[model samples]
Target: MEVVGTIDHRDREEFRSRGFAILPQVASESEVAWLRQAYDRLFVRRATPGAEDFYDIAGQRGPPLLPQIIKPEKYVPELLDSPHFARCRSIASAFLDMAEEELEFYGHAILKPPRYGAPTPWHQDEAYMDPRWRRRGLSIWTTLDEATVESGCLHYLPGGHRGPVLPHHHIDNDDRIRGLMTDDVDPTSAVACPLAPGGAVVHDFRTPHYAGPNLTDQPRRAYVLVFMSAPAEVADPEPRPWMDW
Candidate 1:
């Protein structure tokens, strides 16, 4: 509703140095509440396993019958047109050196409960889409609850995105967890990223990231908004692939 100030100097420096940065209160309490509800409804509607034409737990859903903007506007409108987005865009635009008009809302989401079974394993986000137009994709992950080490918070390897894309292993029967291993990077150096509700983290597409299971009594909830510059190419959509909300 209001035009906030620019990103803090500390965050600007951290984003440049670490390839990622966490900013607090990126969305207000009301915005988070709305997202939780909207996501809950979607979850119920698509709860059946092997359901076709619906959002899978972690897997990509196919072409959305509904408009993509529905999720962000219903879940976190504060971010859609807030100064927070402007600030984030400025940083992302600088990295890609693309005009503002070239950028597009790649996707957004609300990650939900029953977390024990489907933990996302380590993998680069860009690998899921296509390798051709991968360089400028960025993701904004916001905590909708108190994310802790036990509640499936995101873990990332510092400066991992700067290196070449690593080779991933798609473990059979466990599509939720994927990993990339390479001689260039050490898996032991990864750090868990837990944050308070309203706190957010932005990372490059190639950053190696994973989330553990929600061992806590509460659910692991998060709002993720992905951004990509347009006028570029995208690999043709894979057959029967799930869509990201």
Candidate 2:
């Protein structure tokens, strides 16, 4: 991937200090349009086989309150091969001071259906990963539609990434639920980040983030691209019983 432009110093500083930052209008309108179409196509068709990458965060057996595709790039290669992807990777690299080769791309795409979609609970991304590896990464979430608090825009706790992974449980303690959430963190200091279509927010792996339930008539679609620094094995890994898969 080619590096495009330099990331703003303010954004970099915010990320370093707060564990998250907003990058406004990172994707062009045309690119957003294209991605929206691709997103709808994949979700509408459930493109991947056997529901391997599909998830219902709310654990509803019938219809998903919050449907997600884990590796959207596998179904839409254009997602990874576009200018938008390049810019996202470049920004992540610049902020983390890592070379492109040192970063690994992990994928995520979340769809919050209108009027019924559930809120994403507060938790660190590392809570769901293997506890044996020391991980460092960030996720860039670009909205395909206007994101507002009423429509489930992202909210974060500043500097949450500096803390250790907190206790978490599956949504409602349902073992079948694929999503894990932490109730220990206080949301009193949370900051909401609303974005126009094509705008994005980047957050570290350990940031405590959440989104409200979608109450709008239109869907809340977000494409997330994750880049991770090289991983190292931990000598004594902590047990994560909640992540027994």
Candidate 3:
């Protein structure tokens, strides 16, 4: 059990060199229960897009291929006050080198339902960004449930962030889908991270990562917190047609 808020020199070096790092205990055991229940209720009880944004990342709204909830804190304001949120923030600050207050963020949840959840294709988070700005960001992903390869845990290409941004097309060449997948990537050197409940995987925006499909009986839920340096507006916005919603 690694202590919280104790990101040391080794942690820093690993994150910089490997493109990702793990946090053994981002949420306490008790906090995990509270969070999972509240999180589940958001989909069960407050399951209306009329209020909060609930949609799939891999497919159009219906049966969710990769059901995701965006900015969950906006509706569940208490989430911002959760103990894990602070821990994640501190961890992000250590790696991002941004003052906690200056870091722009959006909390997200990806629920991979049991038995048939689709795989999250290989891609960088920056592929979804606007072309008008230069932004540096990372996401600290905490799992409400255990993450396993069978349950679609995160897989990262070690040191993949060292490469420049690669070309990406909309998922299955469908412009309506929000997810952007990078094309023709090799995954021979990738590493799968199977984490315990409440543990986290922090990855740079430039890092290429993928997750497998849920073949297990139980669900796999990942609550992600993104922290980014302030975006600097560019004089010319590049043509990124896939970004058009």
Residues 51-101, candidate 1, lDDT per residue (tens digit)?
553444334342122112325555435546755456567756755557767
Instruction: Report every candidate's CA lDDT.
Output: 0.61, 0.83, 0.81
Q: Report the number of the highest-TM-score candidate.
A: 2
lDDT of 1 at 36: 64
Tens-place lDDT digits, model 2, residues 85-146: 88888988988899987899967888877685577889888998899888788999999999
> Any runs in candidate 3 off by more than 4 Å, and if so which?
1-5, 45-63, 235-241
lDDT score for candidate 2 against the true structure: 0.83
Write down the TM-score of every candidate: 0.69, 0.88, 0.87
Report how far residue 161 has shifted in candidate 3, in Å: 1.2
Give a tens-digit lDDT track for model 3, residues 80-149: 8887888788888889788888888889977877775578889988878887888878999999899988
Candidate 2: segments with Cα more than 4 A from true spot:
1-6, 45-65
Candidates sorted by lDDT, best first: 2, 3, 1
RMSD of each: 7.1, 4.9, 4.5
Q: Report the Cα lDDT for candidate 3.
A: 0.81
